[PDB]
Amino acid sequence: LVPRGSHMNPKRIRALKSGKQGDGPVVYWMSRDQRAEDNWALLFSRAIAKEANVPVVVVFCLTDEFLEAGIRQYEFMLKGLQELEVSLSRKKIPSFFLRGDPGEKISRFVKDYNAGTLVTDFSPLRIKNQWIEKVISGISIPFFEVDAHNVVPCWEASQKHEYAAHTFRPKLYALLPEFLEEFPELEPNSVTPETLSDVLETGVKALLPERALLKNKDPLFEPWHFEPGEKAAKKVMESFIADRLDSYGALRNDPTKNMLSNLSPYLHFGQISSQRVVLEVEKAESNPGSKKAFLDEILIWKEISDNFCYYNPGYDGFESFPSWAKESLNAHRNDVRSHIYTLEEFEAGKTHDPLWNASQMELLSTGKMHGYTRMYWAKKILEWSESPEKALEIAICLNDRYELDGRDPNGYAGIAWSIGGVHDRAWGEREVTGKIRYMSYEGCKRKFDVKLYIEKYS
């Protein structure tokens, strides 16, 4: 229960576990949505706390899986959290950063701090569901989750997997009047109930031996492309609206032009709300066509990616591809591939295709491949791999290791679109790739200045 007139739509919250309410603080286990503003999970947690006459507290688990990615993501995330600590303290909301995996750490925190209720935010990824299961086994209090990431709650937008954007889109657009709304201000707590610097230090030390390097031993990653944190995210949204949105409709498929929003690292870590971004873009007057194109990406393609992972347990595997695509890829499984590259050759940009290699260099060096070349890139991994299953493994591996926005439903769904035709149609049949949409080198040369892209990332 929340207080009357809390302005919380109950369809954004789902019970994970019934239990017996304790009498201590409401705990928001923050995971996907690392921000203090425009955060329905935090707002709901604050409202339940108010109704129960207790403070709200935030807990965040620094998990054992950080060593599966790189310094690039750890630093981006932790520097954000350092800023988040301050923002929350200004609301008199304490934040606790627990070192370990959530099953053990959240269970013990709930016991030690006498939590009344546990709330988390929503992710459809397997790792979050693994963590939920272990937490559920270790707690006796009620446990809710709130969809703070999507404008329309994932379980409301559709009751099933949607095979196409054109079947998801009408369902989603029909629910915006309900769910696309301004956010209330977060009410501070009535009174105030190892540093992150130390953690960051220790973690970087553990990641240093796996850092991506040039043959010169100097690191590949350039950390000045995306300043982390909630405040920077807002400035990137504002600069997009002011300077790039007008040209987005025309230039979003031109990787030589910096005309995308550059919001994905912030959106992935939840340092900015996609609902906020949509409210601000909807209010803007910009060139015809651009707003439509952008909203189709951040509403339909982003939220269909959560739809994909939520309703397909096997979202990272061949089995989740549509039937037409499985049958087509199977029919061509024994076709001789034109090339076969090792994961190390792909990783180092050592194929015979200079556009592919430049796309990989953009990823290595900036942590954000242009969205047009991500499609080209993944499709060539299919073409130059022993099987579609190996192609998925390679693409996921590289995406998750080197993208700042990786380890994300958008990535699994984008790789499945690219390799498996998920949310696509069948195209003309070719050897190796069957009826999966093909993106040729020469087609790219007709579309944009390939030589300039290669020079930029060489």
Ligand SMILES: Cc1cc2nc3c(=O)[nH]c(=O)nc-3n(C[C@H](O)[C@H](O)[C@H](O)COP(=O)(O)OP(=O)(O)OC[C@H]3O[C@@H](n4cnc5c(N)ncnc54)[C@H](O)[C@@H]3O)c2cc1C
């Ligand atoms: C093989 C492949 C891998 C991808 N990997 C990721 C990934 O790891 N993480 C990730 O967040 N996105 C991924 N994408 C989707 C897309 O490429 C990026 O979201 C986009 O490039 C992000 O840059 P931006 O924020 O400047 O994009 P913008 O074009 O300005 O769009 C803004 C937001 O809309 C969303 N969006 C845009 N395009 C897509 C899309 N095709 N699918 C889903 N959402 C979209 C994103 O949240 C994006 O940040 C991938 C796509 C493909 C084909």
